[PDB]
């Protein structure tokens, strides 16, 4: 996370830190006492595209709360993870829920309206290209979907698209996706922030909801928007996978 605020009060107990077997740090989101949401790209880090779910699980390390290790039982990739960059992690044991470890709610409403402000916490790289030592968060607004597709691709028309990504690497954009623009300065998400939740605070209920999971975390304030997976677009697959 470039710029932003330090999680000094511990306001994101659903944030988890995942580490690959070659010491790359990514994010995950506790949605359950036993389950976490993350991206498929995170799970395939330091692997080949030929790896399976049973191959990936033993090579992962996962922390919640204050550097609290949690054992992983298995992972479940989304059946279409090439368009829906999502994976589910199941823990062997129910994690004990307290003020440092607590799942975020899955939303029943669609909060992904252009302009709605969400909170993104992350262990990703900072302004010095270094993995942050303490958890940071940033407030980002949902961006216009067509302007986002226009910035990272050619146009809305499929037969007119071109790369054009200011970071080179192309994000996944489709119906399951929304974008989040620059807050007000040059603060943004960056490498390692993927898997974290675009958290929305429902002031009517005073409840925090995972509206999105950060998928494209390579617009390190040199491209416009990060790209997030709509949680409402995967909620059905999530509830089915959890049981079981």
């Amino acid at each position: 996370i470039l710029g932003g605020h330090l999680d000094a009060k511990g306001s994101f107990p659903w944030q988890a830190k995942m580490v690959s077997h070659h010491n790359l740090t990514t994010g995950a989101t506790l949605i359950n006492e036993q389950w976490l949401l993350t991206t498929a790209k995170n799970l395939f880090l330091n692997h080949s595209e030929n790896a399976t779910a049973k191959d990936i699980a033993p090579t992962l390390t996962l922390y919640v709360g204050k550097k609290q290790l949690v054992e992983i039982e298995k992972v479940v990739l989304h059946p279409n993870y090439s368009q829906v960059d999502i994976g589910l992690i199941k823990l062997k044991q129910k994690v004990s829920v307290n003020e440092r470890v607590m799942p975020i709610c899955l939303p029943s409403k669609d909060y992904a309206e252009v302009g709605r402000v969400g909170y993104v916490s992350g262990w990703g790289r900072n302004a010095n290209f270094k993995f942050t030592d303490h958890l940071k968060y940033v407030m980002l607004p949902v961006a216009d979907q067509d302007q986002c597709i226009r910035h990272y691709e050619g146009s809305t028309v499929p037969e007119k698209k071109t790369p054009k990504s200011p970071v080179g690497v192309q994000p996944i954009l489709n119906e399951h996706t929304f974008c989040a623009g620059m807050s007000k300065y040059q603060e943004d998400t960056c490498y390692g922030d993927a898997g974290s939740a675009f958290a929305v605070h429902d002031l009517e209920e005073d409840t925090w909801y995972a509206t999105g999971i950060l998928s494209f975390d390579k617009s390190c304030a040199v491209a416009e928007y990060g790209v997030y997976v709509k949680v409402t677009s995967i909620q059905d697959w999530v509830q089915k996978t959890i049981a079981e």
Partner: protein
Amino acid sequence: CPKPPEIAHGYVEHSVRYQCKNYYKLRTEGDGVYTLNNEKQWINKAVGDKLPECEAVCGKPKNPANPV
């Protein structure tokens, strides 16, 4: 227990009420109250002998982030 005092020519029926600690909520179709019957069984009226469950509360951070 610890043993309610006994009274002459009286008897006690034991009730118990389940509640969840932080940061959990009670998941049951009954009211959480269970009464001990003659068969050494704690019975709720009426989820039966089915005990409650304590489910974790989601999205209620103890120290939420500063508002927008």
